Amino acid sequence: TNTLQVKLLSKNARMPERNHKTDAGYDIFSAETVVLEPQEKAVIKTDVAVSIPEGYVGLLTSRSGVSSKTHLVIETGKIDAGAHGNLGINIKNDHEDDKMQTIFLRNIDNEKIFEKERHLYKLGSYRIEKGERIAQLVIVPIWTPELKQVEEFEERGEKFGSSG
Amino acid sequence: TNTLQVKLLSKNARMPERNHKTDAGYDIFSAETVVLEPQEKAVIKTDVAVSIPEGYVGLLTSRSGVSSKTHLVIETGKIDAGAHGNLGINIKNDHEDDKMQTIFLRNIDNEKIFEKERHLYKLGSYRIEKGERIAQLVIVPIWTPELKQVEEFEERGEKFGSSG
Amino acid sequence: TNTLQVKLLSKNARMPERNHKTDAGYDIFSAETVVLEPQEKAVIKTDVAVSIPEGYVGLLTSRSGVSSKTHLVIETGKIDAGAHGNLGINIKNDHEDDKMQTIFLRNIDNEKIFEKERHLYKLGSYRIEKGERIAQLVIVPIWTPELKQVEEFEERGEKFGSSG
Numbered sequence A, B, C: 001t002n003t004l005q006v007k008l009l010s011k012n013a014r015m016p017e018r019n020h021k022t023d024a025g026y027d028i029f030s031a032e033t034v035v036l037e038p039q040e041k042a043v044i045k046t047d048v049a050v051s052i053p054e055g056y057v058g059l060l061t062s063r064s065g066v067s068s069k070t071h072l073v074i075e076t077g078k079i080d081a082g083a084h085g086n087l088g089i090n091i092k093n094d095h096e097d098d099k100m101q102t103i104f105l106r107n108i109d110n111e112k113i114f115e116k117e118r119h120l121y122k123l124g125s126y127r128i129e130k131g132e133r134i135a136q137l138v139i140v141p142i143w144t145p146e147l148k149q150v151e152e153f154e155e156r157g158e159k160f161g162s163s164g
Ligand SMILES: O=c1ccn([C@H]2C[C@H](O)[C@@H](COP(=O)(O)NP(=O)(O)OP(=O)(O)O)O2)c(=O)[nH]1
Pocket: A159, A160, A161, A162, A163, A164, B060, B075, B076, B077, B078, B079, B080, B083, B086, B087, B088, B089, B090, C019, C025, C062, C063, C064, C065, C066, C136
């Protein structure tokens, strides 16, 4: 069986699409429109549940476009084989909370938002829109063997940057 | 040989346990009780040394429970095949150092500590306890071939978020 | 074919060297000398273009020596199979911007720079030198199947730190 089961949990959810043929990642879409303040942590719900087969792991990881342009930090999620729950994106707006305020919100391309209705926001605040690609899923085979205590092993020695 | 050798280096160390059958990660325990101040970086010693076989890599990576609840940031460690040293967890308390102080320390579940003896700590300080699961190990097969200079290759072009 | 094609784009580029025989990563060299201010984000150009074969992914990831010693944060890059562009290192100097200033710049080993010509820099500023190993490349096989909507699946339930 060379197929992965994908289950949508709501109308807000969307089917993950792969960009190119040789590409590794499945672009994951957001199911909600959230505003993240500086240093604010949240879990972005995808409303998408997947089933990874045994002997594999899913890497719900950051997209290189958004992560290099914005202060949005995604902690790569290790989706266990047999985890049939809602995939949540572990996000953090790492932008400095320098107490300053602006009238412009920022999107996932670090662009000033063009709101007709004026509001005051914290400097370095971002907005994730619904149906917006913020993360991607990369499935990679694992290796989980048995483990036993040993006094010594069956070499690089015992070396955190031994060289420079 | 479908077995991985695990060597404890002290009484403070503990054997890494896998949660479920289909799960990818081996939950790694802390061997020391450390207090991390805001923006303080440290290497948490596990007192556990493992031997990954050639053609594989170990990912000493963050647990999704602690990383989403707390400001504790673990930089995923790429444990080389044949590295028989003490596994160290590359940690950083990324919480804002806003100079404020509180009498409550925080644990790996972001809960106020109930200390009977009163002390003053920096706001957003965390404590890792001994024998506490803060990180996990995921072994994944690699691929290391020979490499040669080429003027041109044998396509996605030369594209950092070409789409959005 | 058990070979990976590596293409240098300039004289500033260098051939990635693997440290040991059992090691997973290819140490990636910098092609430019950049100074990163506190909280400053940049893309460090390697001037190196590689071609990963289909069914694999490249992990342009942080070196454990530099990442544990310095506030330099590298967001692991997922180099798609068939991406023949310049490998860019997604970097962020995560050091606090506490407005303080010093006369000493810091290198990738967190050491005070010994400049004969005196200058004023921001506290916690780092310098990447040309031909300096700041990141590494780890190639790991992937698994990309077809995907179809399912009402229910063919278990760990729907569980973000169910245990602690
Ligand atoms: O989080 C970590 C990262 C690395 N390590 C260990 C395992 C690994 O074999 C070693 C360093 O591996 P890397 O090549 O990833 N870092 P670096 O190239 O700076 O160290 P060296 O130059 O000595 O290989 O340190 C940990 O224990 N925890």
